[PDB]
Design an enzyme around this catalytic site. Structure first.
Site, short mmCIF file in Angstrom:
data_model
loop_
_atom_site.label_atom_id
_atom_site.label_comp_id
_atom_site.label_asym_id
_atom_site.label_seq_id
_atom_site.Cartn_x
_atom_site.Cartn_y
_atom_site.Cartn_z
N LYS A 103 26.31 -15.48 -33.59
CA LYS A 103 24.91 -16.11 -34.09
C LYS A 103 23.99 -14.89 -34.27
CE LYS A 103 24.62 -19.16 -30.70
NZ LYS A 103 25.72 -19.61 -30.29
N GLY A 161 -1.39 -13.52 -17.16
CA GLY A 161 -0.60 -14.93 -16.89
C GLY A 161 -1.03 -15.51 -15.97
N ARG A 190 -3.39 -16.84 -22.10
CA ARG A 190 -3.13 -15.56 -21.05
C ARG A 190 -4.61 -15.00 -20.14
NH1 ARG A 190 1.21 -12.76 -20.32
NH2 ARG A 190 -0.09 -11.40 -19.36
N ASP A 204 -2.67 -18.43 -7.24
CA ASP A 204 -2.08 -18.27 -6.16
C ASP A 204 -2.42 -17.59 -4.82
OD1 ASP A 204 0.25 -20.40 -7.62
OD2 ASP A 204 1.38 -18.96 -7.87
N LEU A 209 24.47 -4.05 -26.69
CA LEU A 209 24.19 -3.66 -25.87
C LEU A 209 24.13 -4.81 -24.29
CD1 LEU A 209 20.82 -4.67 -27.95
CD2 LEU A 209 21.59 -2.41 -27.11
N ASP A 246 -2.50 -13.26 -8.45
CA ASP A 246 -1.29 -13.77 -7.93
C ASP A 246 -2.25 -12.99 -6.37
OD1 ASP A 246 1.04 -14.97 -5.77
OD2 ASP A 246 1.82 -13.53 -6.42
#
Ligand code: MN
Ligand code: MN
Ligand code: NA
Ligand code: NA
Length: 322
Positions: free
Chosen positions: A62, A179, A139, A243, A52, A182
């Site tokens: 890992k 989240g 959320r 925001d 990938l 905006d």
DNA sequence: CCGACGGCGCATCAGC
DNA sequence: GCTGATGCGCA
DNA sequence: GTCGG
């Protein structure tokens, strides 16, 4: 499928960003977690994962260790290190980044309870992040987003009918949760070529109807703060991050396109724009010459315009996963 | 082998 | 007080 | 840490 692996990579990502202050390794691990999360098979080895894009030699090693043992030695060591775990934790408060988290931990401030006892050492943004620590990590369900949109669009038009406001983000792609909120704002009097308090008047009104409750930062083009839906006896709504960005009209729809995403969609759109002799950024779309020199920005009256220039069929936001 | 990897608005600071 | 650097958050 | 030049 591979949640164990993607969790491990996310932890490592977070350690690199918050403790090592190594932002590029942070993004490398996130990128690896993303691609693996989308892989439609249960990974059996590092080698398989290495196929990938974004998964390299060290990540494949890992994955082998994690598959063999169910853990990472590196990560367990990080977990039982007091300094690292506290630095990592403190960055969860908005306004505390790696530098401040480290400063606080160095002087023995390691928990929310330690922060509360030392509010004199926090700046304004940090005090707000502390105050709404839990709410900011919640959320926002789609139905509340729509209620919020309604209030913002309404109060905006109440200040001046000429304002255009658009709520962007995953919300505009029809996400069942967001989240934060905006909002992109524009106004006729505001152009690339040439009003003094356009954004302020919108922030004022939203404060007036008690929608906006706190301000993290505010200037002539960008506001970041906190808002809350109204309640009637019953449960008060959590405070939310909002925001608002004031964008010149001639760059507004490029703005909406950018801030709507997704990030994967923007990448393949810029990529196709290039194959067709155009360069698209957050602000403008501009044609390229033979040596790769960008010309003057083209006029844009809507998102569709942008799809037209690059001879692309218009993608409705909901189909912009990529 | 090598540097790129997002760039910017605002708050605060460091240096003067 | 000035200016530029840094920290932060965020597509 | 991973990548393309
Ligand atoms: Mn290098
Ligand atoms: Mn390579
Ligand atoms: Na790979
Ligand atoms: Na933070």
């Amino acid at each position: 499928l591979n949640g164990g692996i993607t969790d491990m990579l996310t932890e490592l990502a977070n350690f690199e960003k918050n403790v090592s202050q190594a932002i590029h390794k942070y993004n490398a691990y996130r990128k690896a977690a993303s691609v693996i999360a989308k892989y439609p098979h249960k990974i059996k080895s590092g080698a398989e994962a290495k196929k990938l894009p974004g998964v390299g030699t060290k990540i494949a090693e890992k994955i082998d260790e994690f598959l063999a043992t169910g853990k990472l030695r590196k990560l367990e060591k990080i977990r039982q290190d007091d300094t690292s775990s506290s630095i990592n934790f403190l960055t969860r408060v908005s306004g505390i980044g790696p530098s401040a988290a480290r400063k606080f931990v160095d002087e023995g401030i390691k928990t929310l309870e330690d922060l509360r006892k030392n509010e004199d050492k926090l700046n304004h943004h940090q005090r707000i992040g502390l105050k709404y620590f839990g709410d900011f990590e919640k959320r926002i369900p789609r139905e509340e987003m729509l209620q919020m949109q309604d209030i913002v669009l309404n109060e905006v038009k109440k200040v001046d009918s000429e304002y255009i406001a658009t709520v962007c983000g995953s919300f505009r792609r029809g996400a069942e949760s967001s989240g934060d909120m905006d909002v992109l704002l524009t106004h006729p009097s505001f152009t690339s070529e040439s009003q003094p308090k356009l954004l302020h008047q919108v922030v004022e009104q939203l404060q007036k109807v008690h929608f906006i409750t706190d301000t993290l930062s505010k200037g002539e083009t960008k506001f970041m703060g906190v808002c809350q839906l109204p309640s009637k006896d019953e449960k008060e709504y959590p405070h939310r991050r909002i925001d608002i960005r004031l964008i010149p009209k001639d760059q507004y729809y490029c703005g909406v396109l950018y801030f709507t995403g997704s990030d994967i969609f923007n990448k393949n759109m810029r990529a196709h724009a290039l194959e067709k002799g155009f360069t698209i950024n957050e602000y403008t779309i501009r044609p390229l010459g033979v040596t790769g020199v960008a010309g003057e920005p083209l006029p844009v009256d809507s998102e569709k315009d942008i799809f037209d220039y690059i001879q692309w069929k218009y993608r409705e936001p909901k189909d912009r996963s990529e």
